[PDB]
């Protein structure tokens, strides 16, 4: 599974709509292409994906 290093997160837009109204982008440094779990540890936000 890919190993992710030096992950820093910045939020592009933030509109607290009922729908998935916020978008953030994750910048990282991987080693192989692959898919893995992404999840927000606090219920202040819920990720669509």
């Amino acid at each position: 599974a890919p190993t992710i290093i030096d992950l820093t997160c910045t939020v592009a837009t933030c509109t607290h709509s009922s729908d998935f109204g916020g978008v953030l982008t994750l910048t990282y440094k991987t080693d192989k292409n692959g898919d893995c779990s992404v999840h927000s540890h606090s219920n202040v936000a819920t990720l669509q994906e």
Partner: protein, 48 residues
């Protein structure tokens, strides 16, 4: 012969007058306030 200077060559703010439906055209003064109601089909969803 003693018309004077017509308003065609006097009108301020660059009004040019035409005559038949007598009117002043292209007159540069003031602000037009616009109110616009847009459908959602005329926006673009954030995800796209």
């Amino acid at each position: 012969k003693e018309k004077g200077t017509a308003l065609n060559t006097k009108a301020p703010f660059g009004c040019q007058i035409k005559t038949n439906p007598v009117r002043a055209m292209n007159c540069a003064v003031g602000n037009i306030p616009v109110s616009m109601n847009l459908p959602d089909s005329a926006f673009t969803r954030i995800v796209e």
